[PDB]
Write a protein that binds this ligand. Structure first.
Ligand SMILES: [Mg+2]
Ligand SMILES: [Mg+2]
Ligand SMILES: [Mg+2]
Ligand SMILES: [Mg+2]
Ligand SMILES: [Mg+2]
Ligand code: NA
Ligand code: NA
Ligand code: NA
Ligand code: NA
Ligand code: NA
Ligand code: NA
Lengths: 173, 173, 173, 173, 173, 173
């Protein structure tokens, strides 16, 4: 039953990877929802829509890289339901950016816990995988989202629809 | 509350589109599972893996086009959980192809019912959307999968691991 | 008297096509009026002017394609007066966009009725002509105009002349 | 016995497709006859000959696309004898064009009946296949042939051998 | 109420320009009718059709340039109904050319009266606008149409359908 | 009644050419049937299908060259019904290749008889036409088909579906 390739790969690490795969797919689905919210005729912020669609695809890529990891190490992927996002209506560009920031920080926290587990199980390959492909990506994403939220707030979002319009044009466009 | 763009778009059609979006996302997730099954070290059919990964991405594209439709017509997207696939282990190239064929026929049946609803609601735009973007795509996908299943069976899959190996190389490669 | 090419083309369909030709020419004339309203020295929104002039030419193209249809089927074109637009003065970028949206929805309703007639007369060629060349075009135009109206309103049009200025620059330019 | 790919494809539709295949092959053979009539030394209208030969090959393509359809849907092709054309000697450029027009209208009528059957059997894929690939093609072919017949008649065919000569040169050449 | 740009622009000139705009749009519509007459399957003179369609578009360009003039001078455009053309059926290539010649001479007469008004109101800008953009254009158009009519008549139009055929090919093609 | 170009062209030769035209069209139709047999979802040998479709088109070309011959010599083409092929279902790649070989040998025998007739009628032009365009073509086709049949048999067709699969890939692909 044990994979011929498996070496120094703890069952707990395998399970945590499966959980991270689900979380990445969940994040992808959240971003998809946000994108198409901004595509609504009564919201109509095309560059917000594009920004979040790109993020959705990137999150899918992250999940697939974790699946590849799982198979490389000889673990077995076990997929779960991808839960629907918390909202259907994201209310504003600013609110969407804040929710994205919160999501990214949650994903980062899960990654940090994964790293802690890898460290505890003396799995340096897994640790460096997380470090190389995930942690800096998260730090960058969080910094970018924080920058966006800051600009929107200073511009006067969400009450200034002009604010969101011009942010859509000049930052996200 | 009614969208400014909405015209000749029945609530039942809107709901059916939301169901189709979920079904397309489900199909994408099924194909993702199959792809990474073939990426396992104890299965190791890279071109099967690639074939199903491509199909997964294509299904995601189909879902996104339906979401775009929904917003174009002034309906509102309501996302649901994406259920996990029926299997974790797809057993063989042939079995995966047969399950894919079954899935594609189920998706096609749902599309046909959607078309019937559009027709009943006298929604020619929706009918032609389905016709143009979905129905022929489905017919082609079903024919291709049937061709694959036929070849694998004639070659001697799934007992002939040589059969699947050579199919992976010569058809899917 | 009956055209040598005519086949499965009902008199009622022919008459409805003649009405649609007139409606398309009318829409082209409305858009022409709007364009040159924005060219006034006391309005001076060049990109609004360009947007509506492009729309005018596109509507002319639609009418000409219907005339070509009529001759292809062996019907006979009967032209009518092109009525002058409802306004000389369109008041604002937002008001013009709202009137354009209303016009586009009226044109769409007429197209839907034309499709219904074709269906009732079992004229699949005519149905698919309408579907292929007109219905999606209308859906897109309505969605775009709705997006424009939404943005202008959120920006603060028509009281914010800055709003219309910046929309002219960043969206229509 | 039922094809693994077959879905929503009525036996009556399958039979009608087989009949249409035969009709398209028949039309191809008629045009072949006309082409080589104009290649006779005592007729000697090379561009008529080329025009009808092109039409013959196009009709063959139409038949082959229907065969491909049949297999795509999981129906089974049953071929029949291709009947010889009604004439060996087509008498004149004008007479050939009139017979071609009559043939094209007969083919169109058969296509319309096929569409009606598809509609009655709620086969939207088949309907849109016919609509996309056949109906407009027929309308165009009929209009072109009607234009040709009109010009020949106005020029003075078939008594003015100069008429046919110059039509061969300037229209068909 | 007076435009900030208006200078040396008499109310009578403004009104005459509005009348000329309507006349140019009328001429465009007449030429459109003629074009699609020649597109009929029972007339079938493609190059006549093209010639008149080009003329239609050119006349629309003339109208739009007058509208631009009106706004440049600070007058206000007031559009009127575009009357339907005098005929639905233009009978022959020659008859259409003669009606076009008559139309062009009427347009020219109106332009000459406009010039006379400009001169009487000491509006040298308007005079030179008319001179530069319109008068020579009209002279050329009238000369060309007269040349066409002369050739058709000498060839034997409209009784020689060969005449019109060959004119369509060699002059208009 | 006798063609102005006819010289040294016996009535018996003319009749034999008409028979050969029909036989070539028959062969084309047989190959068409075989091609689309291999396009079936339950057969699914794309390169067999392509091979036989190419052969079908080549046979049509042969028939058309014979028609051109007939007119060049001043004979008159008389077309007959094209009989349907002997089978609807060709059973296997090997069986299809064997039937094709048999067909090609029958066509060759008919050509040899045609040559014998030409020789007996002292028609060296006809003899050399047959020699140049047909006889070597037939010899090559027969040799190729024999090679194919030999390979399939040695590989283990038709019981080894792997055999036909790999032949389709490596020889016909
Ligand atoms: Mg490190
Ligand atoms: Mg700005
Ligand atoms: Mg359709
Ligand atoms: Mg000449
Ligand atoms: Mg020799
Ligand atoms: Na991520
Ligand atoms: Na799909
Ligand atoms: Na339109
Ligand atoms: Na056809
Ligand atoms: Na003019
Ligand atoms: Na042959």
């Amino acid at each position: 039953s044990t994979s011929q390739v498996r070496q120094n790969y703890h069952q707990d690490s395998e399970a945590a990877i499966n959980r991270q795969i689900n979380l990445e797919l969940y994040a992808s689905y959240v971003y998809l929802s946000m994108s198409y919210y901004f595509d609504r005729d009564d919201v109509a912020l095309k560059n917000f829509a594009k920004y979040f669609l790109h993020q959705s695809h990137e999150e899918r890529e992250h999940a697939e890289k974790l699946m590849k990891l799982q198979n490389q190490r000889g673990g077995r992927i076990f997929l779960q339901d991808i839960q629907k996002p918390d909202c259907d209506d994201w209310e504003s560009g600013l609110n969407a950016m804040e929710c994205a920031l919160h999501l990214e920080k949650n994903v980062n926290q899960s990654l940090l816990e994964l790293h802690k587990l890898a460290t505890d199980k003396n799995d340096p390959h897994l640790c460096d995988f997380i470090e190389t492909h995930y942690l800096n990506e998260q730090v960058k994403a969080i910094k970018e989202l924080g920058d966006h939220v800051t600009n929107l707030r200073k511009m006067g979002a969400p009450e200034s629809g002009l604010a969101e319009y011009l942010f859509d044009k000049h930052t996200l466009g």
